[PDB]
């Protein structure tokens, strides 16, 4: 049921409006930190080194660096909001 | 424990959100 | 070889398209 529970989470995550809210917040925040532009310029130069420019290819080299550039404020705020939601949905 | 369950579910969802955000930057970048 | 590749790639993409179409009906139906 593990893969089936993730289906129920995502279902309620989207229907409840939490997916919309969190992705928007996460956009607005990362956009103001200039985290977007940093990751923007980073993918571009990562695409320039390799002729074949595939997302999954550059993902292994860009993803880890992008997580850390996330402001401590944002990362914790979102993680908190995600957990708060999970805490209500999951049963005891 | 239930505590460990939500701990992983949290990280996976956080990753999904950021994974998507990257993808959108990738696709928007090729424009 | 290449013929067999495209045959599966076609079906998989066709399925994705329809799978998504179902999903949108599911979600739109719960509204």
């Amino acid at each position: 049921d593990t893969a089936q529970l993730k289906s129920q989470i995502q279902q309620y995550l989207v229907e409840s409006g939490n997916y919309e809210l969190i992705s928007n917040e996460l956009k607005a925040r990362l956009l103001q930190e200039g985290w977007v532009d940093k990751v923007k310029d980073l993918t571009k130069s990562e695409m320039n080194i390799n002729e074949s420019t595939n997302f999954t290819q550059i993902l292994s080299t860009v993803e880890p660096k992008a997580l850390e550039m996330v402001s401590d404020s944002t990362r914790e705020t979102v993680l908190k909001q995600i957990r708060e939601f999970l805490e209500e949905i999951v049963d005891t | 424990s239930r505590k460990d369950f939500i701990d992983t579910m949290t990280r996976e969802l956080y990753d999904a959100f950021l994974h998507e955000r990257l993808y959108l930057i990738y696709m928007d970048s090729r424009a | 070889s290449r013929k067999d590749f495209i045959d599966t790639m076609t079906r998989e993409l066709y399925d994705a398209f329809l799978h998504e179409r179902l999903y949108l009906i599911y979600m739109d139906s719960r509204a």
Binding site: G17, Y19 | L24 | M27, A31
Partner: peptide, 14 residues
């Protein structure tokens, strides 16, 4: 008015 669906990039499952 309609509900916001995640893009293909939101890879919660797999």
């Amino acid at each position: 008015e309609s509900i916001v669906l995640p893009t293909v990039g939101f890879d919660f499952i797999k």
